[PDB]
Design a protein around this ligand. Sequence first.
Ligand SMILES: Nc1ncnc2c1ncn2[C@@H]1O[C@H](CSCC[C@H](N)C(=O)O)[C@@H](O)[C@H]1O
Ligand SMILES: Nc1ncnc2c1ncn2[C@@H]1O[C@H](CSCC[C@H](N)C(=O)O)[C@@H](O)[C@H]1O
Lengths: 259, 259
Amino acid sequence: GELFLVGMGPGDLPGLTQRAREALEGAEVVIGYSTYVKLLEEMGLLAGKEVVRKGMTEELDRAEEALERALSGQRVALVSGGDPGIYGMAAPVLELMEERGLKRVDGGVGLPGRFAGEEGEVFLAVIPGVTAANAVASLLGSPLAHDTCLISLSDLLTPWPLIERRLHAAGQGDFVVVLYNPQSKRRDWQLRKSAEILLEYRPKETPAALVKSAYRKRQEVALTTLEGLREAEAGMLTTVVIGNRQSRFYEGTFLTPRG
Amino acid sequence: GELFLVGMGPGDLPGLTQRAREALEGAEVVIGYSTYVKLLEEMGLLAGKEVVRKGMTEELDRAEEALERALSGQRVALVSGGDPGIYGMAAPVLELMEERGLKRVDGGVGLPGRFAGEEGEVFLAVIPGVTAANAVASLLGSPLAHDTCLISLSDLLTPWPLIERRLHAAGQGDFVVVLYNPQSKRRDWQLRKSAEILLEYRPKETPAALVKSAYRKRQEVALTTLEGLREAEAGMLTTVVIGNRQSRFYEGTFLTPRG
Ligand SMILES: Nc1ncnc2c1ncn2[C@@H]1O[C@H](CSCC[C@H](N)C(=O)O)[C@@H](O)[C@H]1O
Ligand SMILES: Nc1ncnc2c1ncn2[C@@H]1O[C@H](CSCC[C@H](N)C(=O)O)[C@@H](O)[C@H]1O
């Protein structure tokens, strides 16, 4: 069967690539987390297709569901917000295929590729999409105009000590920092802690920003400073951007110099 | 006037977002480096528009050209490969506007935004696109599935010592690394040096890859190891990806684990 991991971009119809539109068009079954599936449903892109979102809350369940359906011979589209390879479905799917002992049967390298196992075969492809970092940057100015680090604050499946390590490294290397999954329930202090770590490498007045629901309804852009981040509140659909030692604000824009 | 910095994505027609297509459609004048402009011309997207590519070799010239035209009241589309905010035109344009003393006249934050000065006004917007990192990752597997660092090896306008610093930090933090502008003429040793720096933090057998002209003609995917990178040759349209201490190869795919 076919299994296409389709990156949706930030969330609006214009945000998808034609390649993503085409992948959805050819899919017989579309799988993804409720919120994303509904966005596509509202766009009117899932008419006449089997839509699967019930019981798709868990990352692993979505991957297993999509893989078993593809192995059975269905043309599946597993949707991800932004890009599937950035804290998305690409990794869970490959890890599951590896676990199931699927082997490449076309002699190729990378993807797309055809794989097969005792339980069938699957043509796997990843359709890229605009990731949150680039999407929120377009709503800020040129914050990522220089070397950037992408870090997820989702301690889920990743030790906080390591995240601290990633933050110190990003801090000492003077990288612009983009925080994915900035705030949680279990640990409502991670954002503040992240800011304090970075504060040891760059000024309090270092430009920072919290962009919520980029390109979606209730989109919100909030400019602040690294120091201000210590008391900031972030949602589940928020991406935080922290400038480097050269970043500065220019007439409302977050400007990170090219040189 | 209008000035839209349009991200083209990797280079093929399906790679553009509908938002990018729409920005080009509404533009009266399209500006960009020869190679990118021609790609769009081949796609048949510039019919009936004033196309500017002669004398557009320099980054600064393209920005100045686009800005002066917009200030004069033209609807301009300044095109960039991938995303305009990743080693693109977003920074040069903002820096030029700042230099010219343009001030925001709509009370907004971030972008899009309207700016004006002694020489006129301009409505500035950045249309995001799939950046090379995400585009080549889709052709590899799930290499960027965890925290990633984007570094440009273009010593142009950026001291090599700093790049070394960025590399050591990325190395010590165990970040997956994506190298933009990997090889030059003046310094045909930067790639090898970069590999040697990272070799002090992760194994020789650490997965690595060189992806050339992703989604374009003569696209090429080459899998190798960090050690192998010391003797690798990269082109101007090549992006290099180096896995972290957990990355591994799986049946032809570059797999960086999610946890
Ligand atoms: N529209 C949007 N606006 C702001 N941040 C967003 C966003 N969509 C996704 N994110 C960010 O991404 C996190 C989910 S992690 C999955 C990310 C996705 N594969 C991508 O490429 O963007 C969120 O917690 C948030 O930090
Ligand atoms: N189609 C493609 N395949 C591989 N690398 C590419 C590419 N297009 C751009 N790049 C990478 O980007 C570098 C130019 S720097 C400009 C990058 C662009 N704004 C973006 O978002 O991708 C190249 O030297 C190369 O490393």
